[PDB]
Enzyme design. Structure first.
Site, mmCIF file in Angstrom:
data_model
loop_
_atom_site.group_PDB
_atom_site.id
_atom_site.type_symbol
_atom_site.label_atom_id
_atom_site.label_comp_id
_atom_site.label_asym_id
_atom_site.label_seq_id
_atom_site.Cartn_x
_atom_site.Cartn_y
_atom_site.Cartn_z
ATOM 1 N N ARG A 29 47.559 47.920 42.026
ATOM 2 C CA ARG A 29 48.208 46.738 41.490
ATOM 3 C C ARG A 29 49.263 47.101 40.489
ATOM 4 O O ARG A 29 49.067 47.965 39.625
ATOM 5 C CB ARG A 29 47.182 45.764 40.876
ATOM 6 C CG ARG A 29 46.061 45.394 41.842
ATOM 7 C CD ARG A 29 45.044 44.476 41.244
ATOM 8 N NE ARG A 29 43.962 44.209 42.196
ATOM 9 C CZ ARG A 29 43.099 43.215 42.068
ATOM 10 N NH1 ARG A 29 43.176 42.395 41.034
ATOM 11 N NH2 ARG A 29 42.155 43.023 42.986
ATOM 12 N N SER B 260 34.751 38.748 40.989
ATOM 13 C CA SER B 260 35.147 37.379 41.363
ATOM 14 C C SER B 260 34.648 37.143 42.802
ATOM 15 O O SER B 260 34.997 37.913 43.701
ATOM 16 C CB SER B 260 36.659 37.191 41.321
ATOM 17 O OG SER B 260 37.092 36.959 39.994
ATOM 18 N N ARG C 21 35.072 49.423 36.206
ATOM 19 C CA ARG C 21 34.534 48.514 35.178
ATOM 20 C C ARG C 21 33.021 48.623 35.031
ATOM 21 O O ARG C 21 32.516 48.491 33.920
ATOM 22 C CB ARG C 21 34.969 47.058 35.405
ATOM 23 C CG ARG C 21 36.429 46.834 35.051
ATOM 24 C CD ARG C 21 36.840 45.386 35.191
ATOM 25 N NE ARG C 21 38.253 45.231 34.837
ATOM 26 C CZ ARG C 21 38.851 44.078 34.553
ATOM 27 N NH1 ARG C 21 38.161 42.948 34.548
ATOM 28 N NH2 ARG C 21 40.137 44.050 34.244
ATOM 29 N N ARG D 159 41.951 47.805 32.639
ATOM 30 C CA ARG D 159 43.138 47.514 33.432
ATOM 31 C C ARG D 159 43.749 48.852 33.912
ATOM 32 O O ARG D 159 44.037 49.737 33.095
ATOM 33 C CB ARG D 159 44.148 46.699 32.613
ATOM 34 C CG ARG D 159 43.994 45.180 32.754
ATOM 35 C CD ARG D 159 44.898 44.615 33.841
ATOM 36 N N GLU E 7 34.684 40.258 32.592
ATOM 37 C CA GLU E 7 34.750 40.137 34.048
ATOM 38 C C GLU E 7 34.592 41.487 34.767
ATOM 39 O O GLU E 7 35.231 42.466 34.369
ATOM 40 C CB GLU E 7 36.092 39.512 34.404
ATOM 41 C CG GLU E 7 36.170 38.993 35.823
ATOM 42 C CD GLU E 7 37.569 38.609 36.243
ATOM 43 O OE1 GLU E 7 38.338 38.103 35.394
ATOM 44 O OE2 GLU E 7 37.894 38.806 37.432
HETATM 45 C C1 FZT Z 1 40.584 47.898 36.827
HETATM 46 N N1 FZT Z 1 40.683 46.515 37.313
HETATM 47 C C2 FZT Z 1 41.932 45.876 37.262
HETATM 48 O O1 FZT Z 1 42.878 46.437 36.723
HETATM 49 C C3 FZT Z 1 41.973 44.539 37.793
HETATM 50 C C4 FZT Z 1 40.856 43.954 38.253
HETATM 51 N N2 FZT Z 1 39.644 44.625 38.252
HETATM 52 C C5 FZT Z 1 38.424 43.979 38.757
HETATM 53 O O2 FZT Z 1 38.618 43.636 40.114
HETATM 54 C C6 FZT Z 1 37.837 42.455 40.376
HETATM 55 C C7 FZT Z 1 38.290 41.791 41.658
HETATM 56 O O3 FZT Z 1 39.709 41.405 41.524
HETATM 57 S S1 FZT Z 1 40.175 39.887 41.748
HETATM 58 O O4 FZT Z 1 39.599 39.145 40.684
HETATM 59 O O5 FZT Z 1 41.581 39.987 41.890
HETATM 60 N N3 FZT Z 1 39.516 39.445 43.134
HETATM 61 C C8 FZT Z 1 39.630 40.201 44.320
HETATM 62 O O6 FZT Z 1 40.297 41.237 44.299
HETATM 63 C C9 FZT Z 1 38.887 39.717 45.568
HETATM 64 N N4 FZT Z 1 39.161 40.615 46.710
HETATM 65 C C10 FZT Z 1 37.384 39.754 45.293
HETATM 66 O O7 FZT Z 1 37.004 41.023 44.789
HETATM 67 C C11 FZT Z 1 37.984 41.634 39.108
HETATM 68 O O8 FZT Z 1 36.856 40.784 38.983
HETATM 69 C C12 FZT Z 1 38.007 42.701 38.003
HETATM 70 O O9 FZT Z 1 36.721 42.887 37.422
HETATM 71 C C13 FZT Z 1 39.515 45.929 37.806
HETATM 72 O O10 FZT Z 1 38.469 46.561 37.871
HETATM 73 NA NA NA Z 2 39.119 37.180 38.808
#
Ligand code: FZT
Ligand code: NA
Ligand code: FZT
Ligand code: NA
Lengths: 420, 381
Positions: A264, A348, A387, A273, A345
């Protein structure tokens, strides 16, 4: 994508449901495009009637020995305008489709109506945040001690928002991901998958990242080739396995699990992050009648990871003003982070309804009607691996700065029970 | 990069050794630039000095490594020397199928869904084949860490240009990389191998003599935009379990033998017949002084096919990275030597496992060492 017939005919009711997400539907533009369409369609109908009559009147004029030049010229002019009438109707439909591709999903009736993050409800919490008898350290302080978590070397290689793990912390990270995949395949009925980490644009449009959220993706621009994007989540690759297909009802539910890096281009310190992070993703392709019960199960599957690692967490039901673009209903799992004295978080879990299935034409043959109908899709983190490692490091820290290995991870840690 | 002293003091011998690789060293241009720098120095302006320095450095970064005197002299792959073999390739009592026909039967190896997602040279694996791929990578990393003395590492898969220049992929081989153009930031490149990220851990450092050897192992996807190439044999993305060594220069040729044995052990434990090839001067990789290739038996092709490349880079990458160690004899910070080898390319191990372990009915028997990772599955399909 919402149902086009619903947006075109009921823009006011669709706008009112969308307003709960803070999204203002362009009802004036939908109605103006619809007025233009109706006006052009009425003109093509009257011209079709006029041209058909004139074209057949040539036959009759010939039988009378009359001049057909005035008639041919009329028919030719009428034909040319009908061709433009088609171009106008196509460009109106083209503009309407482009607009419908930028509309977020409709929240389910059960979602609490809220303008922002503060209207999110706690559904339940599990376990008790530990009361430490010494000053808690964060995962950066904990992991840096012996160089086993190294952000400097990662910055030297790749710049900011990258990590390097070594020795027992790298093994603990792999242990976490292996434990998650083994759990979902052995106890939660998910089929394991290895997928590409580079996809073309159609896949991202199928799940909703495209056209609107292109700036959040890493793109590989290629000369005379279709561009490639790094997947932001295995949701993109897993969900699109069923694009352009009419599945048998007997094949439902299709449950997929993948462990992949996630890329990302979007405290947030250390591993919270990152531009790259590992995530064990759960995806379901279900019968529309069962998707809201499926969401409850999906959320319980992500929770099970945290319960088994004995990590105190909280389940939040996201309100209308705090959901992802393609979601009808979401539950966020938030793990306890001792150094921050709050839950953060870690997953999700969403029900997308038929929104992604519409964009990718993922269908099933309905047994009652025999007609091909859209499936429902769901996705959820089980879990974001980096995380969980932050949570493991902080919740399992000891006074000397060493880390106790969680019980369920000892079979993967080759005899290590305490780190450092 | 080559030793600048050697290029200056022994130009003819360095050029003659490089000519065994088919590389023509431009001694004339190097010495003409050295004369211009010397003339500009005796006069000193900054424009001409930086242009000559930029030209000289660009030339210097384009020179491949000097082959070790024990490397067979040859022009192409046909001059590569088989040094040993292991195991007896299986004689089957039925018509052998390739990994594509084997894997595609139940939708467990799916090139079509992968093509729909990503275009050509991608793969999608499901169920027991995906589990077997994961079992293979776990087996390799558990083996190297528990028995071969390697420290495990999770690394970035996106690097900036200096790391690729450190290992030799840049500047000369940019076309073989997937680049992420970043507006108002340094561009990122997808790693072609974990060698890039692992070797560069020691860049710009003076290690302790006591810290040597540093042995790293990583399991990562590998991305490249570059004989039978069907299915998983050639891919834009593949998994590889990489071994990297940072060693005392005096021990590097014994370290290559040890590194090659580490890679070989994976094939022995999987009971996969193979051969070891000492690459000739004309078939060696840019940054190598000496290379051994492992070539696994592929039943459908009735021949051995490359699955690993084990190399000693000498001080070549260390020179580019300024990766040094404090020498206990002299006290001076001296360049380290670096080595890397696949242990192994996971996709190609899967091809070899599917094909060598296939049965009459198209089913695949699970290798003995992989059974603890296969959740009770002993026969695939
Ligand atoms: C390190 N990191 C990040 O930099 C950004 C997010 N997260 C975790 O990824 C989870 C899922 O991302 S989301 O919320 O965009 N949802 C999805 O990607 C769907 N495919 C369902 O997983 C978040 O809950 C962050 O905890 C990181 O770990
Ligand atoms: Na989320
Ligand atoms: C699928 N696939 C490819 O498409 C290309 C290569 N390989 C295998 O990767 C091994 C290592 O690649 S290499 O020879 O360039 N050497 C390195 O990358 C070093 N860092 C040492 O590993 C080759 O031997 C191919 O078998 C694929 O598997
Ligand atoms: Na090679």
């Amino acid at each position: 994508m919402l149902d086009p017939k619903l947006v075109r005919t009921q823009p006011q009711e669709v706008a009112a449901r969308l307003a709960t997400r803070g999204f203002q539907l362009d009802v004036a533009r939908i109605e103006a495009l619809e007025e233009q369409r109706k006006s052009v369609q009425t003109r093509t109908e009257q011209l079709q009637a006029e041209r058909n009559a004139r074209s057949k009147a040539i036959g009759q004029a010939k039988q009378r020995g009359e001049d057909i030049a005035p008639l041919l010229a009329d028919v030719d002019r009428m034909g040319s305008e009908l061709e433009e009438g088609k171009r106008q109707l196509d460009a109106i439909q083209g503009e309407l489709d482009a607009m419908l591709l930028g509309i977020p999903n409709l929240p389910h009736e059960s979602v609490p109506v809220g303008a922002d993050e503060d209207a999110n409800v706690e559904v339940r919490r599990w376990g008790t945040p530990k009361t430490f008898d010494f000053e808690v350290k964060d995962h950066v302080a904990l992991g840096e001690r012996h160089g086993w978590l190294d952000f400097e070397t990662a910055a030297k290689l790749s710049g900011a928002r990258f990590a390097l793990m070594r020795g027992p912390i790298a093994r603990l990270h792999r242990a976490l991901a292996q434990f998650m995949i083994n759990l979902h395949t052995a106890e939660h009925g998910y089929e394991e998958a290895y997928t590409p980490y580079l996809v073309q644009a159609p896949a991202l449009q199928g799940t909703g990242q495209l056209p609107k959220f292109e700036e959040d993706l890493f793109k590989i621009g290629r000369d005379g080739e279709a561009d490639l994007y790094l997947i932001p989540t295995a949701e993109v690759s897993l969900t699109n396995i069923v694009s352009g297909q009419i599945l048998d009802a007997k094949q439902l539910p299709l449950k997929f699990v993948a462990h992949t890096p996630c890329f990302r281009s979007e405290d947030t310190r250390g591993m919270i992050r990152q531009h790259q992070f590992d995530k064990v993703e759960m995806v379901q392709i279900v019968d529309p009648a069962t998707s809201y019960e499926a969401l409850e199960g999906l959320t319980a599957n992500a929770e099970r990871v945290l319960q088994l690692l004995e990590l105190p967490y909280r389940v939040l039901a996201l309100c209308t003003g705090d959901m992802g673009f393609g979601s009808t209903k979401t539950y966020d799992l938030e793990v306890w982070v001792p150094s921050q004295d709050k839950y953060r978080e870690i997953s999700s879990c969403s029900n997308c309804g038929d929104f992604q299935a519409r964009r990718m034409q993922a269908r099933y043959r309905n047994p009652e009607t025999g007609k091909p109908e859209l499936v429902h899709t769901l996705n959820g983190s089980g879990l974001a691996v980096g995380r969980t490692l932050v949570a493991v490091l902080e919740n399992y820290q000891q006074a000397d700065g060493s880390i106790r290995v969680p019980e369920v991870l000892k079979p993967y840690m080759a005899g290590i029970e305490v780190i450092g």
